[PDB]
Amino acid sequence: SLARAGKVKNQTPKVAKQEKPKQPRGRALKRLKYTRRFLSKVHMNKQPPGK
Amino acid sequence: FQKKKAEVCIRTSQFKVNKLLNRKQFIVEVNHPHWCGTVPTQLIRKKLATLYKVPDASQVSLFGFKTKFGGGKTTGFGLIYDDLASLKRFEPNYRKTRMGFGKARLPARKSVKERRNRNKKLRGKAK
Amino acid sequence: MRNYNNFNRVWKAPRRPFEKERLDREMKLCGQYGLRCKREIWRVNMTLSKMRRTARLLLTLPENHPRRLLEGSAIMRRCHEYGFLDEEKDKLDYVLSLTVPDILERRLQTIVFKAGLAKSVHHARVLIQQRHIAVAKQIVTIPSFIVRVSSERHIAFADASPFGNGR
Amino acid sequence: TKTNGQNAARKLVRLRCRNRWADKGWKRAHTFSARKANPFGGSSHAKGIVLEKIGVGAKQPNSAIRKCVRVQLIKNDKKIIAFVPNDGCLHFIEENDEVLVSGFGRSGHAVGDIPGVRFKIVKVSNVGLYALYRQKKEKPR
Amino acid sequence: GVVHSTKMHRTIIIRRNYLHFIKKYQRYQKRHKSLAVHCSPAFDPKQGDEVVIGQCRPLSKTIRYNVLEVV
RNA sequence: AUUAGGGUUCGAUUCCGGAGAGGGAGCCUGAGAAAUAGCUACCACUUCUACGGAGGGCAGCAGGCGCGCAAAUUGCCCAAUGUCAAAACAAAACGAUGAGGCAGCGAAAAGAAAUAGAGUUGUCUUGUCAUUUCAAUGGGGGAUAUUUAAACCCAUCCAAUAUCGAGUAACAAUUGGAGGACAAGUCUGGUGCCAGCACCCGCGGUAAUUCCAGCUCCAAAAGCGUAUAUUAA
Ligand SMILES: [K+]
Ligand SMILES: [K+]
Ligand SMILES: [Mg+2]
Ligand SMILES: [Mg+2]
Ligand SMILES: [Mg+2]
Ligand SMILES: [Mg+2]
Ligand SMILES: [Mg+2]
Ligand SMILES: [Mg+2]
Ligand SMILES: [Mg+2]
Ligand SMILES: [Mg+2]
Ligand SMILES: [Mg+2]
Ligand SMILES: [Mg+2]
Ligand SMILES: [Mg+2]
Ligand SMILES: [Mg+2]
Ligand SMILES: [Mg+2]
Ligand SMILES: [Mg+2]
Ligand SMILES: [Mg+2]
Ligand SMILES: [Mg+2]
Ligand code: NA
Ligand code: NA
Ligand code: NA
Numbered sequence: 182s183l184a185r186a187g188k189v190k191n192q193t194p195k196v197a198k199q200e201k202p203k204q205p206r207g208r209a210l211k212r213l214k215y216t217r218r219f220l221s222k223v224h225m226n227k228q229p230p231g232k
Numbered sequence: 233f234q235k236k237k238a239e240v241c242i243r244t245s246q247f248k249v250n251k252l253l254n255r256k257q258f259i260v261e262v263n264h265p266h267w268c269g270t271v272p273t274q275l276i277r278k279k280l281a282t283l284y285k286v287p288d289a290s291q292v293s294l295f296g297f298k299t300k301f302g303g304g305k306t307t308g309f310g311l312i313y314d315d316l317a318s319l320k321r322f323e324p325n326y327r328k329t330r331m332g333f334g335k336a337r338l339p340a341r342k343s344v345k346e347r348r349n350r351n352k353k354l355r356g357k358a359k
Numbered sequence: 360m361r362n363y364n365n366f367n368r369v370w371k372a373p374r375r376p377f378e379k380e381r382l383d384r385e386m387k388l389c390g391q392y393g394l395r396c397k398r399e400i401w402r403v404n405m406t407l408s409k410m411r412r413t414a415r416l417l418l419t420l421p422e423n424h425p426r427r428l429l430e431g432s433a434i435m436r437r438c439h440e441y442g443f444l445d446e447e448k449d450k451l452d453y454v455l456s457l458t459v460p461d462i463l464e465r466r467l468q469t470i471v472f473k474a475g476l477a478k479s480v481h482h483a484r485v486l487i488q489q490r491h492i493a494v495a496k497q498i499v500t501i502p503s504f505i506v507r508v509s510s511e512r513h514i515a516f517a518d519a520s521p522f523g524n525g526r
Numbered sequence: 527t528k529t530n531g532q533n534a535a536r537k538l539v540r541l542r543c544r545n546r547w548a549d550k551g552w553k554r555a556h557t558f559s560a561r562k563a564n565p566f567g568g569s570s571h572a573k574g575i576v577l578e579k580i581g582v583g584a585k586q587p588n589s590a591i592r593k594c595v596r597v598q599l600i601k602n603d604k605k606i607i608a609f610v611p612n613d614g615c616l617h618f619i620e621e622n623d624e625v626l627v628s629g630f631g632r633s634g635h636a637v638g639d640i641p642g643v644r645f646k647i648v649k650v651s652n653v654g655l656y657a658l659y660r661q662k663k664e665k666p667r
Numbered sequence: 668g669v670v671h672s673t674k675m676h677r678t679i680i681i682r683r684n685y686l687h688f689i690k691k692y693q694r695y696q697k698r699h700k701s702l703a704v705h706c707s708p709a710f711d712p713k714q715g716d717e718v719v720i721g722q723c724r725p726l727s728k729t730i731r732y733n734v735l736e737v738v
Numbered sequence: 739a740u741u742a743g744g745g746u747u748c749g750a751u752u753c754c755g756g757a758g759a760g761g762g763a764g765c766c767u768g769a770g771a772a773a774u775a776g777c778u779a780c781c782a783c784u785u786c787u788a789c790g791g792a793g794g795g796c797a798g799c800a801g802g803c804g805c806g807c808a809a810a811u812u813g814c815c816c817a818a819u820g821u822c823a824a825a826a827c828a829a830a831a832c833g834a835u836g837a838g839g840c841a842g843c844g845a846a847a848a849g850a851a852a853u854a855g856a857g858u859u860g861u862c863u864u865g866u867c868a869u870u871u872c873a874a875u876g877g878g879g880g881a882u883a884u885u886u887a888a889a890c891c892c893a894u895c896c897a898a899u900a901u902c903g904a905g906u907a908a909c910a911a912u913u914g915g916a917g918g919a920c921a922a923g924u925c926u927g928g929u930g931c932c933a934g935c936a937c938c939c940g941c942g943g944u945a946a947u948u949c950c951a952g953c954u955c956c957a958a959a960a961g962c963g964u965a966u967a968u969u970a971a
Binding site for chain 1: 383386387389393394395396483484
């Protein structure tokens with residue numbers, strides 16, 4: 182029919198991105214990731230349970 | 233760190249006497265441990281003239297100075313001519329213009345080219 | 360046009376983009392030596408690969424082949440000069456055993472850190488980038504500067520730096 | 527089994543030359559039929575004009591109306607079907623719009639559940655279609 | 668070379684048979700070249716005879732060699 | 739280029755060789771040309787004209803129009819490298835050179851490299867956290883100047899009596915992903931075989947690990963996707 186083009190994208194409620202503090206760039210970002218992955222079965226993005 | 237007066241010390245390397253062009257040729261390296269910026273060429277000229285017992289400083293030619301990375305030292309090339317006449321006779325004109333006794337710049341080459349191309353259409357008296 | 364200045368690449372990407380063990384080992388090397396990106400490890404990898412390929416080609420030859428006597432001597436000289444190999448070992452077979460930390464240990468960042476002029480490799484990096492470090496009175500601003508064994512005793516703060524003799 | 531003779535080089539050369547034609551990729555690389563039949567004429571992209579917006583039903587077991595455009599290529603007047611590659615991106619495309627087309631990733635093979643299409647839209651009116659999708663640009667005129 | 672034909676007047680065709688090596692297959696190919704050679708009446712070569720020939724200035728459209736000896 | 743080896747593939751393009759100057763063919767001069775910013779003629783196109791006539795050849799440089807997916811300034815200069823020449827330079831007296839060099843544009847590609855470093859109190863041996871303290875440094879602004887033919891870049895410096903500047907260091911990093919291949923969520927909303935995704939396998943039909951989004955996380959990072967070729971696989 183071609184009339185339903187963009188249905189879901191237009192339907193999706195618009196949610197604003199929230200103002201987060203700025204992450205370090207470059208070598209400091211690697212420093213942060215190293216000090217999180219080490220010096221602290223590992224799950225890198227563990228989520229809370231939910232249904 | 234102690235605050236002190238800016239000092240400049242001249243050194244000379246690969247010295248050669250050139251009878252053919254009436255001059256001495258050498259690399260000049262300057263050491264300026266506490267100098268704000270670059271030592272101007274005229275200052276090095278006066279220091280070199282005093283160092284080499286040259287009667288007049290205008291017969292010293294200096295060019296192509298490369299400051300070292302990290303500061304405190306610059307290196308260039310130097311020429312000491314037997315007299316002022318030899319300097320003005322043998323020097324490239326741009327270096328003479330640097331020292332203030334060069335020739336005036338000729339008109340723009342585009343205009344010279346255009347006038348030369350106009351004349352190719354003309355016979356004797358007119359062109 | 361009619362310009363004959365050479366250039367070449369110094370690094371190569373890994374063949375497998377997501378190996379968990381390789382990724383973890385590289386992140387470790389980045390954290391412990393304070394690197395900015397994986398390209399630095401991969402540059403060391405290319406250097407090591409070239410050296411090892413040369414050593415294999417040389418060892419395949421008979422021991423008294425003039426090419427072996429020349430180039431093996433040169434490569435041993437370079438490895439001893441830059442501290443990649445210990446001066447005790449002098450055979451051609453010890454280049455084959457060189458590892459990435461062996462080269463990474465000779466970076467100016469790691470050397471400045473190990474010399475106590477910096478509190479960490481991250482302090483050493485910014486110290487080098489800010490012209491506070493001189494090797495034999497020459498300011499060196501490159502953290503990947505590979506330090507010769509002879510230059511290790513001449514690494515101090517730069518004279519022009521406020522940590523040396525500067526304003 | 528193969529010939530082994532020390533002076534049997536000609537047999538081996540002729541044999542390899544003959545059998546190299548059985549490799550489909552080599553034959554396609556060393557003949558003109560694919561390049562002639564290829565609407566892009568061997569190019570990576572081609573510019574065209576949008577004739578009409580059409581809906582192509584996805585193949586079983588999928589069920590969808592894949593939004594495509596019929597486009598006539600500027601260089602050779604060939605007519606193709608090209609996919610519009612995101613959600614609601616069909617509204618960025620109008621009839622007679624100038625459009626840049628690329629391959630679909632499989633070198634002329636049809637891709638996914640879209641039955642007989644090997645092309646997709648990447649630009650319209652000289653701006654990136656994905657750029658319009660993310661509202662990074664505006665459509666001229 | 669070996670004499671291949673004596674049909675022409677004062678001119679003969681010789682063959683230079685050789686093996687050509689194909690690097691990829693590490694093997695050889697039989698190949699031959701043919702040269703038209705002027706033959707002086709001082710020689711009477713036959714088909715299958717071996718001849719030594721020497722290069723000279725062009726003597727015709729094809730002839731660039733002269734029979735120097737018949738083995 | 740790719741490659742353990744054997745190979746596969748690309749080579750219009752900087753050096754060497756050949757060829758051509760819209761197409762064809764002739765030719766004069768000359769040591770050397772079948773020369774084309776030489777001549778002659780025809781064929782196409784094409785410019786000026788007072789209609790008698792007379793002209794043209796960018797596959798040189800720059801720049802147009804077209805063609806295309808696809809490629810810069812109608813810039814400066816002969817300072818360097820060379821060529822020619824009746825010619826060293828200079829002295830009334832400066833040879834020509836879009837060859838060449840220099841700059842502009844230029845994320846083809848290549849090298850180096852920022853986007854922070856040390857802390858204090860408590861909170862929770864580390865490590866995150868709200869702080870609240872220090873120094874350091876470039877990006878940038880400038881200069882006694884330096885460089886350059888002149889400019890511009892790089893370097894040098896922020897007194898040598900006398901020289902600016904970071905705290906949301908807002909001077910705020912992106913591009914693709916998170917079911918498998920393949921690193922990373924059995925999170926939360928929306929949709930309901932639709933919209934869409936998906937190179938392949940597949941996901942979506944009301945509890946979507948796959949779509950549209952927020953959050954979080956992953957990979958590479960001043961880069962990262964996509965298409966088409968090609969090499970390995
Ligand atoms: K010519
Ligand atoms: K340029
Ligand atoms: Mg070529
Ligand atoms: Mg050529
Ligand atoms: Mg010619
Ligand atoms: Mg033309
Ligand atoms: Mg001609
Ligand atoms: Mg021309
Ligand atoms: Mg009249
Ligand atoms: Mg003509
Ligand atoms: Mg042009
Ligand atoms: Mg061309
Ligand atoms: Mg041009
Ligand atoms: Mg381009
Ligand atoms: Mg040129
Ligand atoms: Mg739901
Ligand atoms: Mg859901
Ligand atoms: Mg599921
Ligand atoms: Na389905
Ligand atoms: Na998601
Ligand atoms: Na997505």
